[PDB]
RNA sequence: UUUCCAACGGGGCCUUUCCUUCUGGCUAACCAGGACUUUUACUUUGAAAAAAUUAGAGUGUUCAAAGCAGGCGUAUUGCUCGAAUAUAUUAGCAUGGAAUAAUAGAAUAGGACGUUUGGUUCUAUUUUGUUGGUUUCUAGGACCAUCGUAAUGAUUAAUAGGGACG
RNA sequence: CUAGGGAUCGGGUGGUGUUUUUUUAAUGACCCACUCGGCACCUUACGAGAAAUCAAAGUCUUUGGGUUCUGGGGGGAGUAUGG
């Protein structure tokens, strides 16, 4: 949990899997200059039924323009390592003395809502009322990459804080 | 419900529900910024700045896949229009009606065609002088309202 | 113009269940017109209903059981002391047994007893069965 | 209608039925990614153009503005999506 | 206007029984009587370091502030060391349950320590009457411009 | 009242639900102390609302309308009940309530989290030695040189309008 | 918002779509469908109205989407008077 690429943010569990915390940065002629500048806050384990825990990596907001050209390929590559266990990157979003409107509390987690998958957007909110309770919200596709298999645990990873029925 | 002409009409540029860049654009948002940069730069209005090279170049808008709308790359290139690209326009609509004005004297229909586009003048002078981005002490007038143009 | 929404709401509701439907497609709508339909629910003279999105105004989707006769707005939305809740009972209700004026509030929105209940009145909005 | 969410019609009834009249909106015209017969540069004109394309290394007018969409000059490969 | 060594009128405007000491002169240099406005009024810092006179002004003059506090809009400040407010409200009328809007234009005196523009936001207080239509002073300018020094130099 | 099954309430706290900083009584229960997660419109609880009118105990004025009057033994030299409350919006004065409508911050980031640092207005409760010309470190505000800070500011593009072009 | 329609006209599309002929569906125009603009029609009237009738002269005693101007029995009288 200790040693190099961070900006030294450090949480107590980074290094029992990540290889790509220490020896990325030997395989790699230019993930070398992407990997190495990146920081991420803290590691939350979270238990979804079966053992299973989803690790909540608190990525900062400017490690995500180049980070999406490598999350295709990194999520499954702590899937080498620790299986049934699970790797979703999550950011964090200003709350709002003076407070302005446009990202108030619930559009803090907006983009803490596309955030679980990646890159097939939105189709919108189908919220239910006596089945606010269940809360319908869908998306629309090109492509299933990681929507349509790991979403069971997206379930028990988002209300709390694209509801995960989605037909293709 | 359309003001000043009695007619019902829908011009349609209508947005589904995604955001960002969805299937197939593969250029960053660097790319199509420098892009508007460059379109910029031609020095023309923003109507045919779009209307050209939103559809010679792949441009989806330039909202979507650049980040910064149009009047807000240009007030920060230095090449910012003086009245933006509308009351300008609707002041060439005065222009080519005025013209015509004296070409023949009784076109009574140009008298009531001109009160129209005056009135809707007025109201986004008003409107520029609301949220201050026309300087409240010049008045729009006739007698500015075809040498501002051509 | 749609200067009340909440008005361009249920009459769509009257052209709907007057005209015999089972539901109708609200848009626009706001919460007012949200929390307004979730009181309605609570009291279940309308039944199940759904808001989906887009990002723009929304839609509302609603499946009752008939029970809806009469809404409407009470337009403009006057401002009501406790005592006078029951002035506005007796005008506009069908018996004193049953039926609903309800309110906004600075406690919300909540018909007239609960009202009475929670101890304050406030705003009309709109008269419900 | 009776008993059926409109999450749940039968779908591409309404889908037609323009635009922004359908359950959600969703515009009508398309995307293409054509190559010109002067460079074979993929050259994005819009469906419903109003611009005339001079050509990238020719200075042909390669299509013609219509309403509706616009009218090309062949010579335009096509292909899906 | 008044071109201050202040004394324009035809009589030496000074602090009534305040008495720059003319045999001894000495580090003191300012001889300037000044009050407290009562009820947390911070003192306007013109009026600790000003050479105008003002007899009505609650901070260096022989008036005092009481019962009532007022809000509202400037208008017309072409008056001379006073300004007039307008007061707007909702009258009501039971015969319909409804409002009505209706206004009061109070002439309230301003001090020199202030300096106003019509369309401001004035507070003022109740004093002993000062003229006809006078029973108020200006004690609080919450200017609610928006800061306009630099803001056409915009990005 | 021992009390098994569910139900109506708000609170202590918690699943980013800040519910704050401020420390002597102190080892936050609550009392001084610096800012509120903005100000009006709205409403909720007090207070002011003269007595006489209007609503009502109780009183066999013989019922009453009235009236606030009065009842009880060995009448042995006395005993003893009263003369309520309801009400009266705006305006005015106090506090929450947290919708509604209003007013908009942070588009310069010449701004906040700045727990930061040269320098500016400073400074005497002081300790100075008793009291006043000559001083500092120094308690308590602001910014330029100046960058360290968390999640640094663009609520929409309307089956509402205004442009362009076809 | 609802009926229900075969056409219209102003636009947009082309069916292994039918013929003169650009070459089966080109110029144009068609059967079958689909869209918004203008002009209309007639049905059962759910709703009304006193009634002729009205898809709005509706969703008003189950009375409140927003806003403007008029009427209070007949006359005398749109008369006098004044602006």
């Not at chain 2, 460059?38 to 045919?48: C, F, H, I």
């Not at chain 2, 090449?79 to 004005?101: C, G, M, Q, T, W």
Request: hydrophobic residues 40%.
């Amino acid at each position: 949990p200790q040693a190099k690429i961070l900006s030294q943010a450090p949480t107590e569990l980074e290094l029992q899997v990540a290889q790509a915390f220490v020896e990325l940065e030997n395989s790699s002629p230019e993930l070398k200059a992407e990997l190495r500048p990146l920081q991420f806050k803290s590691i939350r384990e979270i238990d979804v039924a079966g053992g299973k825990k989803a690790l909540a990596i608190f990525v900062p907001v400017p490690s995500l323009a180049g980070f999406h050209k490598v999350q295709t390929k990194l999520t499954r590559e702590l899937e080498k390592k620790f299986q049934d266990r699970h790797v979703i990157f999550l950011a964090e979003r200003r709350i709002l003395q003076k407070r302005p409107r446009s990202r108030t509390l619930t559009a803090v987690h907006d983009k803490i809502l596309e955030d679980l998958v990646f890159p097939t957007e939105i189709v919108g909110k189908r919220v239910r009322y006596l089945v606010n309770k269940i809360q319908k919200v869908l998306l629309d596709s090109k492509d299933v990459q990681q929507i349509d298999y790991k979403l069971e645990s997206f379930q028990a990873v988002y209300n709390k804080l694209i509801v995960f029925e989605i037909p293709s | 419900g359309r003001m000043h002409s009695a007619g019902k009409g829908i011009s349609s540029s209508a947005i589904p529900y995604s955001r960002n860049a969805p299937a197939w654009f593969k250029l960053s948002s660097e790319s199509v910024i420098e892009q508007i940069v460059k379109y910029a730069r031609k020095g023309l209005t923003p109507s045919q700045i779009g209307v050209l090279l939103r559809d010679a170049h792949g441009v989806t808008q330039a909202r979507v896949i650049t980040g910064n709308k149009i009047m807000r790359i240009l007030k920060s290139n230095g090449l910012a229009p003086e009245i933006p690209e509308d009351l300008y326009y609707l002041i060439k609509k005065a222009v080519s009606v005025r013209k015509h004005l004296e070409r023949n004297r009784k076109d009574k229909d140009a008298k009531f065609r001109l009160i129209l586009i005056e009135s809707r003048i007025h109201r986004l002078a008003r409107y520029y002088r609301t949220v201050a981005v026309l300087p409240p002490n010049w008045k729009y007038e006739s007698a500015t309202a075809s040498a501002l143009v051509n | 113009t749609r200067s009340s929404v909440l008005a361009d709401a249920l009459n769509a509701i009257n052209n709907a269940e007057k005209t015999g439907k089972r539901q109708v497609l609200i848009r626009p709508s706001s919460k007012v017109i949200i929390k307004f339909l979730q009181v309605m629910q609570k009291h279940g003279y309308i039944g199940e209903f759904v808001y989906i999105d887009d990002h723009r105004s929304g839609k509302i989707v609603v499946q009752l059981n008939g029970r809806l006769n009469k809404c409407g707005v009470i337009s403009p939305r006057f401002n009501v002391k406790i005592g006078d809740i029951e002035k506005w009972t007796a005008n506009l209700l069908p018996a004193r047994q049953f039926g609903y004026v309800i309110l906004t509030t600075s406690a919300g929105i909540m018909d007239h007893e609960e009202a009475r209940r929670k101890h304050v009145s406030g705003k009309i909005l709109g008269f419900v069965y | 209608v009776l008993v059926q969410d409109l999450l749940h019609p039968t779908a591409a009834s309404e889908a037609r039925k323009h635009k922004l009249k359908t359950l959600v909106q969703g515009p009508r015209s398309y995307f293409l990614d054509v190559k010109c017969p002067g460079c074979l540069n993929i050259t994005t004109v819009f469906s419903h153009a109003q611009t005339a394309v001079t050509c990238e290394s020719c200075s042909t007018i390669l299509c013609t503005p219509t309403g509706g969409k616009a009218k090309l000059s062949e010579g335009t490969s096509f292909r899906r999506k | 206007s008044t071109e201050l060594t202040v004394q324009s009128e035809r009589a030496f405007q000074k602090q009534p029984h305040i008495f720059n000491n003319p045999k001894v002169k000495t580090s003191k240099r300012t001889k300037r009587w000044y009050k407290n406005a009562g009820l947390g009024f911070k003192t306007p810092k013109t009026a600790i370091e000003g050479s105008y006179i003002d007899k009505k002004c609650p901070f260096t003059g022989l008036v005092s502030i009481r019962g009532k506090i007022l809000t509202g809009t400037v208008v017309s400040t072409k008056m001379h060391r006073t300004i007039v407010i307008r007061r707007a409200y909702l009258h009501y009328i039971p015969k319909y349950n409804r409002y009505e809007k209706r206004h009061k234009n109070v002439p309230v005196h301003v001090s020199p320590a202030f300096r106003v523009q019509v369309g401001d936001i004035v507070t003022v207080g109740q004093c002993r009457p000062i003229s006809k239509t006078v029973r108020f002073n200006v004690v609080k300018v919450s200017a609610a411009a928006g800061k306009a020094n630099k803001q056409f130099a915009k990005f």
